[PDB]
């Protein structure tokens, strides 16, 4: 529907049958989840944020449900402070920024 | 506008008569600009995210134009990789997330 930004835009996600909380993040290119175990092939990547860089594992074609919307795509896993849903998946689920 | 998220949401900002570019970041609580000279008193803060924390300076009641919408608010200044408009000022200009 329509999300205020008076508070953090947090939504429940479901990934591999687990429920997680995550932040709808227009300032993130990619979706980055806190450390967790996923199946299949991965490649190591370095991503930047506000305070510097972190190592993550990239996993492709992972099914995620974000606030009721089924998505499938790339998930980075690493020491992010909060689970983040970035533009790759926001675009998949039809999310725009309006004002 | 209804800004789409196929590309980083970079927008025109105007502050103190200077034209800059900033990223609309729903993942940021507050607005943080690259090093620049602003008027008035300020206080040191730390802000954190991926990669850890950086030291910034906080200025109050700073007028800023974001996509032609006028805002006035707290602006942090410090070594962010990119100018960032956070939720503080996204709220003032009327921003919502819509899926």
């Amino acid at each position: 529907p329509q999300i205020t930004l008076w508070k953090r835009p947090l939504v429940t996600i479901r990934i591999g049958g687990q429920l997680k909380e995550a932040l709808l993040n227009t300032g993130a290119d990619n979706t980055v989840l806190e450390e967790m175990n996923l199946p299949g092939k991965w490649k190591p990547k370095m991503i930047g944020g506000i305070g510097g860089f972190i190592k993550v594992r990239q996993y492709d074609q992972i099914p995620i449900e974000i606030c009721g919307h089924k998505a499938i795509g790339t998930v980075l896993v690493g020491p992010t402070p909060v689970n983040i849903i970035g533009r790759d998946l926001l675009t998949q689920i039809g999310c725009t920024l309006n004002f | 506008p209804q800004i789409t998220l196929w590309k980083r949401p970079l927008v025109t900002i105007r502050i103190g008569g200077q034209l800059k570019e900033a990223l609309l970041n729903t993942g940021a609580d507050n607005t943080v600009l690259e090093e620049m000279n602003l008027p008035g008193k300020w206080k040191p803060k730390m802000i954190g995210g991926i990669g850890g924390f950086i030291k910034v300076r906080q200025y109050d009641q700073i007028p800023i134009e974001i996509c032609g919408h006028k805002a006035i608010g707290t602006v942090l200044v410090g070594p962010t990789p990119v100018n960032i408009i956070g939720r503080d000022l996204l709220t003032q200009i009327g921003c919502t997330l819509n899926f």
């Binding site: 932040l23 993040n25 300032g27 993130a28 290119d29 990619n30 980055v32 990547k45 370095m46 991503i47 930047g48 944020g49 506000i50 992010t80 402070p81 909060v82 983040i84 970035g86 | 990223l23 970041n25 993942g27 940021a28 609580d29 507050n30 943080v32 802000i47 954190g48 995210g49 991926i50 924390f53 962010t80 990789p81 990119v82 960032i84 956070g86």
Partner: peptide
């Protein structure tokens, strides 16, 4: 608690 979750691809 951290509050700025800028993130940029490799």
């Amino acid at each position: 608690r951290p509050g700025n979750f800028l993130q940029s691809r490799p």
